[PDB]
Amino acid sequence: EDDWSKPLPPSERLEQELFSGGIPVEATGNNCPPHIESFSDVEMGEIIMGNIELTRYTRPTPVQKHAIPIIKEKRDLMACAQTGSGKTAAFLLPILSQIYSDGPGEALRAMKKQYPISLVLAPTRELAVQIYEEARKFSYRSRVRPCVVYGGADIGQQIRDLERGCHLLVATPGRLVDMMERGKIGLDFCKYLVLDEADRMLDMGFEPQIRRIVEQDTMPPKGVRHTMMFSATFPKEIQMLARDFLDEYIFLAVGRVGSTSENITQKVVWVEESDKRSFLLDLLNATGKDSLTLVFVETKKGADSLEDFLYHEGYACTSIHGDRSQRDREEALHQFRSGKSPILVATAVAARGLDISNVKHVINFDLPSDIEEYVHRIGRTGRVGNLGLATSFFNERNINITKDLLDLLVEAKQEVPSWLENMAYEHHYKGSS
């Protein structure tokens, strides 16, 4: 049989291809394996150590010091770390290491529809490619062929890439489901599940697809598969997702766990329904050359009406809602992402699963009845380096979220309209006399 631990012949055109480019730590859980200080503190194999040297990694990052020995000891992981912490290599290195050591497993040898040994789920195309490229570096001179798929691109070329073999699959949840329904991917032998930037995936409304992939198909249950979740923040829906997806897991926090709606400037203004169009025009006239603007409306009839208004007023824009054919919605998303139509009108429901690459300005033309939905919507702007802007139109129709919105603005240390805190005021708490 095949030896998956002993490296394949090199290829320096491929080497130049791959490798010629540019404080507190909390760990809680039961029987947590001790952290490492060097990559050699645990045995990650011949192939991994060789590829580590090609990538010129000299010392493990904080998150790698703790996560790598955890994953290698086959323990589930909930990790709160931010971008630039080296979390990609933190799960790729021990996973690939174990695959080299263990091999494909008797199933894939008795067969040799693609069956990934490892699956990494990402919110966006950009992050998906980042993970994919790192995987190529560490799968070099091995028999693990990494593949990446994502929406907004030709599925035909992605299917072709898949059929050349994939043992590690990086995917956005929507395109993976599409591959599964088309019968191109099976999860029967997926032993390594990774959710990278899980919080943003839920922001973009990927949770149903994720739970369909993990819980409703053929993927091994927890305790059999090894599952790792990485998230910058730790809101309640992530905690619930962690409890459901993880078994006997270690909680790792590198730095302070990020706040909800961080890196976002939020403005709330009072606008009557009749004035929302004109008010929007003033907001659009304070827009840069092409900074992408995402406008949320409640209904599809409202979306069409708004776009019709914007078109007549001379604005380059497009729309995405349910009453559109799929050919129109895919082209609309293409024209938004390319800046040809820098203004996207969309209902929240239609925006779900779409790779809208965090715009510079989110405008809540209509506010939701739900503050958790508000958090998901404004999450469509703001990163780490780029401060995002979220402007919301508020009137009597939104009175039910007055207090939650106020509380959120205060927690995020944002500006509060004096009329908003006035409307939220409760005389019960003043006291007698």
Ligand SMILES: Nc1ncnc2c1ncn2[C@@H]1O[C@H](COP(=O)(O)O)[C@@H](O)[C@H]1O
């Ligand atoms: N051990 C390491 N030494 C040096 N750079 C690293 C290490 N691990 C990851 N990186 C870099 O950190 C970035 C990855 O950030 P992240 O988004 O946390 O995966 C990439 O630029 C990597 O090259």
